Amino acid sequence: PISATMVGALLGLGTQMYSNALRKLPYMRHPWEHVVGMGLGAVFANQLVKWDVKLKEDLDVMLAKARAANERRYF
C-alpha cells in the first residue's frame, strides 16, 4: 500500500523539481539528480520511521521512571 519508502521517494522527487522550479529551471533539468533525490527521500523516510519507534520505546521507560518516582510520595 502506502509505505515509508514510496512516500520518501515521492517527496525526494518533489523536492528536486521544487528546487528546479524555484531556480526557474525546467522541472527535469538534471534527471540523475531526481534519481539521487528519490533515493535520499526513501532512505530518510525509512530512517525516520525507525527513529520514531526507538523514541517511543525510550519515552515509555522514562515515563515508567517518572511514574515510579511520583508514586513514591504515597508511601
Partner 1 sequence: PDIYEGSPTPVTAFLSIAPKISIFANILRVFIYGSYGATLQQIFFFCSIASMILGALAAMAQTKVKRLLAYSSIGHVGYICIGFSCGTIEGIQSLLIGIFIYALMTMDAFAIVLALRQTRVKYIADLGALAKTNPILAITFSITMFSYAGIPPLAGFCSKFYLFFAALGCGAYFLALVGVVTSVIGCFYYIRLVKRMFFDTPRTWILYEPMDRNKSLLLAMTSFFITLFLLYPSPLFSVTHQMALSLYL
Partner 2 sequence: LEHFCECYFNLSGLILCPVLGSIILLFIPNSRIRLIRLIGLCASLITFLYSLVLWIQFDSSTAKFQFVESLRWLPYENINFYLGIDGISLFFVILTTFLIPICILVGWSGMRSYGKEYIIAFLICEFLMIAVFCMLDLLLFYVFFESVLIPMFIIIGVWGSRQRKIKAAYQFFLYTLLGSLFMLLAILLILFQTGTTDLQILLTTEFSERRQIFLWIAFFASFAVKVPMVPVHIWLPEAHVEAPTAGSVILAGILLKFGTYGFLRFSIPMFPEATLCFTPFIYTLSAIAIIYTSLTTLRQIDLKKIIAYSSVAHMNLVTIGMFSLNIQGIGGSILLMLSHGLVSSALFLCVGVLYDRHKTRLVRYYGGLVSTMPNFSTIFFFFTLANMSLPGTSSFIGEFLILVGAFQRNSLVATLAALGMILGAAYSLWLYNRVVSGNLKPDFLHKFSDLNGREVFIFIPFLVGLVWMGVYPKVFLDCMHTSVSNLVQHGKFH
Q: Which residue from 1, 2, 24, 72 is in contact with partner 1, where contact means CB under 8 A? A: 24
Query: Is 19 an interacting residue with respect to partner 1 (CB under 8 A)?
Result: yes
Grid coordinates belonging to 73 = 510520595
Query: Is 2 an interacting residue with respect to partner 1 (CB under 8 A)?
Result: no
Q: How many CB atoms lie within 10 A of CB 11?
A: 17
How many residues touch partner 2 under the rule CB under 8 A: the total is: 4
Give CA–CA dist 19/55, Å, rounded.
31
Query: Is 62 an interacting residue with respect to partner 1 (CB under 8 A)?
Result: yes
Give the dihedral sign, CA 53/57/58/62.
positive
Q: Which residue from 3, 19, 48, 52 is in contact with partner 2, where contact means CB under 8 A? A: 52
